[PDB]
Design an enzyme around this catalytic site. Sequence first.
Site, PDB file in Angstrom:
ATOM      1  N   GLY A  23     -12.459  19.878  29.083  1.00 23.08           N
ATOM      2  CA  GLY A  23     -11.049  20.119  28.967  1.00 23.08           C
ATOM      3  C   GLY A  23     -10.630  18.934  27.939  1.00 23.08           C
ATOM      4  O   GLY A  23     -11.498  18.307  27.474  1.00 23.08           O
ATOM      5  N   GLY A  61      -6.997  16.754  25.848  1.00 26.16           N
ATOM      6  CA  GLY A  61      -5.598  16.643  25.228  1.00 26.16           C
ATOM      7  C   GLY A  61      -5.298  15.394  24.569  1.00 26.16           C
ATOM      8  O   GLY A  61      -6.567  15.082  23.918  1.00 26.16           O
ATOM      9  N   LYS A  62      -4.107  15.351  24.146  1.00 29.59           N
ATOM     10  CA  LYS A  62      -3.972  14.072  23.250  1.00 29.59           C
ATOM     11  C   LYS A  62      -4.765  12.690  23.523  1.00 29.59           C
ATOM     12  O   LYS A  62      -4.866  12.188  22.560  1.00 29.59           O
ATOM     13  CB  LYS A  62      -2.381  14.125  23.142  1.00 29.59           C
ATOM     14  CG  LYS A  62      -2.002  13.102  21.921  1.00 29.59           C
ATOM     15  CD  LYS A  62      -0.438  13.494  21.564  1.00 29.59           C
ATOM     16  CE  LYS A  62       0.277  13.258  22.647  1.00 29.59           C
ATOM     17  NZ  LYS A  62       1.889  13.406  22.205  1.00 29.59           N
ATOM     18  N   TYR A  63      -4.746  12.408  24.682  1.00 26.13           N
ATOM     19  CA  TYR A  63      -5.011  11.182  25.071  1.00 26.13           C
ATOM     20  C   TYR A  63      -6.550  10.983  25.792  1.00 26.13           C
ATOM     21  O   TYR A  63      -7.001  10.021  25.856  1.00 26.13           O
ATOM     22  CB  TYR A  63      -3.981  10.432  26.218  1.00 26.13           C
ATOM     23  CG  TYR A  63      -2.779  10.424  25.677  1.00 26.13           C
ATOM     24  CD1 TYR A  63      -2.310   9.496  24.721  1.00 26.13           C
ATOM     25  CD2 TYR A  63      -1.868  11.478  26.195  1.00 26.13           C
ATOM     26  CE1 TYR A  63      -0.976   9.420  24.332  1.00 26.13           C
ATOM     27  CE2 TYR A  63      -0.471  11.349  25.727  1.00 26.13           C
ATOM     28  CZ  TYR A  63      -0.089  10.383  24.740  1.00 26.13           C
ATOM     29  OH  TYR A  63       1.106  10.577  24.349  1.00 26.13           O
ATOM     30  N   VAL A  90     -12.157  15.617  28.843  1.00 21.48           N
ATOM     31  CA  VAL A  90     -12.543  15.535  30.174  1.00 21.48           C
ATOM     32  C   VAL A  90     -13.988  16.190  30.110  1.00 21.48           C
ATOM     33  O   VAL A  90     -14.277  17.558  29.614  1.00 21.48           O
ATOM     34  CB  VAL A  90     -11.800  16.209  31.126  1.00 21.48           C
ATOM     35  CG1 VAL A  90     -12.203  16.421  32.392  1.00 21.48           C
ATOM     36  CG2 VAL A  90     -10.436  15.359  30.985  1.00 21.48           C
ATOM     37  N   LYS A  97     -13.726  11.301  32.162  1.00 26.22           N
ATOM     38  CA  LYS A  97     -12.535  11.260  31.620  1.00 26.22           C
ATOM     39  C   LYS A  97     -12.704  10.061  30.320  1.00 26.22           C
ATOM     40  O   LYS A  97     -12.509   9.069  30.791  1.00 26.22           O
ATOM     41  CB  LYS A  97     -11.396  11.023  32.098  1.00 26.22           C
ATOM     42  CG  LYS A  97      -9.938  11.164  31.231  1.00 26.22           C
ATOM     43  CD  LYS A  97      -8.901  10.595  32.205  1.00 26.22           C
ATOM     44  CE  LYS A  97      -7.320  10.743  31.573  1.00 26.22           C
ATOM     45  NZ  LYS A  97      -6.294  10.538  32.117  1.00 26.22           N
ATOM     46  N   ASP A  99       4.746  13.473  34.013  1.00 27.99           N
ATOM     47  CA  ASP A  99       3.784  14.726  33.241  1.00 27.99           C
ATOM     48  C   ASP A  99       3.617  15.711  34.101  1.00 27.99           C
ATOM     49  O   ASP A  99       2.245  16.558  33.980  1.00 27.99           O
ATOM     50  CB  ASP A  99       2.782  13.929  32.392  1.00 27.99           C
ATOM     51  CG  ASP A  99       2.315  14.911  31.304  1.00 27.99           C
ATOM     52  OD1 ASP A  99       3.172  15.807  30.862  1.00 27.99           O
ATOM     53  OD2 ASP A  99       1.077  14.604  30.910  1.00 27.99           O
TER      54      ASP A  99
HETATM   55  O1  LIG Z   1      -6.876  12.714  33.985  1.00 33.65           O
HETATM   56  C1  LIG Z   1      -7.082  12.706  35.120  1.00 33.65           C
HETATM   57  O2  LIG Z   1      -6.663  12.313  36.198  1.00 33.65           O
HETATM   58  C2  LIG Z   1      -7.922  13.963  35.231  1.00 33.65           C
HETATM   59  C3  LIG Z   1      -8.538  13.889  36.757  1.00 33.65           C
HETATM   60  C4  LIG Z   1      -9.417  14.966  37.084  1.00 33.65           C
HETATM   61  C5  LIG Z   1      -9.792  15.907  36.200  1.00 33.65           C
HETATM   62  C6  LIG Z   1     -10.623  16.890  36.477  1.00 33.65           C
HETATM   63  N1  LIG Z   1     -11.001  18.100  35.631  1.00 33.65           N
HETATM   64  N2  LIG Z   1     -11.331  19.152  35.902  1.00 33.65           N
HETATM   65  C7  LIG Z   1     -11.717  20.132  35.198  1.00 33.65           C
HETATM   66  C8  LIG Z   1     -10.656  20.493  34.011  1.00 33.65           C
HETATM   67  C9  LIG Z   1      -9.936  19.826  33.588  1.00 33.65           C
HETATM   68  C10 LIG Z   1      -9.150  20.407  32.502  1.00 33.65           C
HETATM   69  C11 LIG Z   1      -9.389  21.947  32.138  1.00 33.65           C
HETATM   70  C12 LIG Z   1     -10.479  22.694  32.760  1.00 33.65           C
HETATM   71  C13 LIG Z   1     -11.072  22.171  33.813  1.00 33.65           C
HETATM   72  C14 LIG Z   1     -12.232  22.485  34.848  1.00 33.65           C
HETATM   73  C15 LIG Z   1     -12.720  23.609  34.991  1.00 33.65           C
HETATM   74  C16 LIG Z   1     -13.786  23.563  35.897  1.00 33.65           C
HETATM   75  C17 LIG Z   1     -14.140  22.559  36.811  1.00 33.65           C
HETATM   76  C18 LIG Z   1     -13.463  21.617  36.658  1.00 33.65           C
HETATM   77  C19 LIG Z   1     -12.470  21.464  35.602  1.00 33.65           C
HETATM   78  C20 LIG Z   1      -9.276  15.867  34.775  1.00 33.65           C
HETATM   79  C21 LIG Z   1      -8.457  14.818  34.546  1.00 33.65           C
END
Ligand SMILES: O=C(O)c1ccc(/C=N/N=C2c3ccccc3-c3ccccc32)cc1
Length: 327
Positions: free
Chosen positions: A40, A42-44, A47, A62, A150
């Site tokens: 994933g 975003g602007k900041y 991931v 991240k 947010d």
């Molecule tokens: O900014 C944060 O605090 C933060 C914490 C945890 C996560 C975890 N993200 N995981 C996944 C994710 C994030 C965005 C879009 C798709 C996915 C995805 C798909 C499969 C398994 C895990 C994730 C992100 C930010």
Amino acid sequence: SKARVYADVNVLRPKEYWDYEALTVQWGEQDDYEVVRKVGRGKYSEVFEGINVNNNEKCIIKILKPVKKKKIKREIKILQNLCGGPNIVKLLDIVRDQHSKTPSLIFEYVNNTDFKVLYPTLTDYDIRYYIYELLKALDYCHSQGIMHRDVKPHNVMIDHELRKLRLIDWGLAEFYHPGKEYNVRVASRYFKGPELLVDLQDYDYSLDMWSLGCMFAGMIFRKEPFFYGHDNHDQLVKIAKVLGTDGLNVYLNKYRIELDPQLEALVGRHSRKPWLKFMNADNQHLVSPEAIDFLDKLLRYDHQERLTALEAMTHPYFQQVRAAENS
Ligand SMILES: O=C(O)c1ccc(/C=N/N=C2c3ccccc3-c3ccccc32)cc1
């Protein structure tokens, strides 16, 4: 304006709890964590799914885009303060690369289900269940003196197989201090409360409850996002066309706010549209009288009138979810 609950949390806690600028980051070992795949962005930040090469367990990496030291410290301190709370994402480590000093935050992993494919499949009970789980996270962070600022579907991770929810991305979160004027440039447009849109800066935890109400309206009415403005002025117009302008005027007069003449002109005059006017064939199985009553108590112009997270959790809409948990 001040919060009606949890107003004194950071008044009574030691300055070290909320004085995030005083934080000294104890950097971990970048080599402990290897990127596997991007998931994933975003602007900041971006991931990635990653691997902890010591125990060979999954993690989330991240990688932060360039940001001021003050802001990184804020996110870290908030994550540390909340770590272990219900449905809060768990920060495990903080590292950076030697050459560029780009910081990464290392989180627990979870098998996320993409909300854009998940939400169309949620049943009535599922909506009640997941919203209740999100409320647990919000009442917790509010009780710890923190506003998320947010809330939106992209920041709510759901592993639907395990029925496990986490509220993520505390990069816009802040500590609540009575009377403090905050920046209104927070939240995603579609989830911004009227307070942000009219420049009411002494807002509080109740901002998150407007954002939550927008998600809930989107779920029960199968409209995502529910209030779809193209810019911030249009966002207020979209809201006013639903809640009506009489209530807006009452709100503006109460808090002694004058709209920018331009914005005043765009908003015009509108009657309130009853929530039932949004019911249709595609959403009818999700739209109940308890759902409408609950929604109506979240989506209020006046932030002081909205349900708190704790009040929301006790609304009879969630009675079966509470009964299931209480056994
Ligand atoms: O900014 C944060 O605090 C933060 C914490 C945890 C996560 C975890 N993200 N995981 C996944 C994710 C994030 C965005 C879009 C798709 C996915 C995805 C798909 C499969 C398994 C895990 C994730 C992100 C930010």
